[PDB]
Amino acid sequence: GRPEWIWLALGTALMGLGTLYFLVKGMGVSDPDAKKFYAITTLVPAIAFTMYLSMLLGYGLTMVPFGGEQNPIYWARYADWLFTTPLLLLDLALLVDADQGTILAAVGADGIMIGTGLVGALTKVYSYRFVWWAISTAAMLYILYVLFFGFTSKAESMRPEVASTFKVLRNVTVVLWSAYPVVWLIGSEGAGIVPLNIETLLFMVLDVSAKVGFGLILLRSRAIFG
Ligand SMILES: *C/C=C(C)/C=C/C=C(C)/C=C/C1=C(C)CCCC1(C)C
Numbered sequence: 001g002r003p004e005w006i007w008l009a010l011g012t013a014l015m016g017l018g019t020l021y022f023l024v025k026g027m028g029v030s031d032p033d034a035k036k037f038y039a040i041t042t043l044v045p046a047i048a049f050t051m052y053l054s055m056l057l058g059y060g061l062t063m064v065p066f067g068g069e070q071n072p073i074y075w076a077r078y079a080d081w082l083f084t085t086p087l088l089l090l091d092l093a094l095l096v097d098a099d100q101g102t103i104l105a106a107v108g109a110d111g112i113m114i115g116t117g118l119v120g121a122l123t124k125v126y127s128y129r130f131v132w133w134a135i136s137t138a139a140m141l142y143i144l145y146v147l148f149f150g151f152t153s154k155a156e157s158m159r160p161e162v163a164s165t166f167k168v169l170r171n172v173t174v175v176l177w178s179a180y181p182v183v184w185l186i187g188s189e190g191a192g193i194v195p196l197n198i199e200t201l202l203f204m205v206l207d208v209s210a211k212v213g214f215g216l217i218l219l220r221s222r223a224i225f226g
Pocket residue numbers: 081084085088113114117118133136137140177178180181184207210211
């Protein structure tokens with residue numbers, strides 16, 4: 001009966017349909033390189049579907065006391081993001097032939113970003129919630145820096161069509177990811193200005209764009225073929 005349920009339902013639908021479509025297209029292709037991108041990219045909305053569905057059915061929500069009140073916090077989001085965000089990075093890394101060490105560092109930073117975001121989301125001392133938020137944001141900015149400078153440098157050694165597809169996906173990633181810390185800061189987890197129903201709408205748009213939108217761009221490109 002929670003007012004945000006409608007956006008959880010729509011999120012479930014869009015992630016489910018995205019997953020099914022990517023699976024149908026992916027199962028059809030024979031190229032080994034393209035199959036790898038399909039496998040990674042189909043798994044992303046599949047995981048998001050399972051977590052959206054879990055939240056829709058009333059799981060992954062806990063009450064956290066801070067600022068003198070009991071606050072509803074969706075922790076299931078972090079279980080989704082812990083796996084889906086590095087998978088998205090791996091898609092980008094494979095496109096540009098990024099170094100193994102660069103991948104390890106980016107994925108490591110991503111784990112820090114999600115883990116500290118979750119710790120912040122669960123923290124009972126109000127001021128300290130924002131310390132964890134700041135650490136998580138710093139880790140995110142490391143990732144965006146590496147994507148923008150490092151991965152782009154690697155992309156420039158690829159065929160222009162691969163570099164071009166990478167730049168579109170890079171741009172989508174920078175724009176969408178950079179919004180998440182702001183939604184958290186102003187929403188249910190942070191300042192409590194934006195109500196949970198609207199916050200859930202915002203994360204749904206961001207999530208669907210970052211997974212299904214991203215995947216549509218990637219999987220329709222010739223860049224994924226060996
Ligand atoms: C499919 C889901 C995606 C692409 C989610 C990306 C999520 C982030 C970039 C979240 C970053 C966060 C911070 C920068 C600090 C506050 C808490 C986190 C998890 C929301």
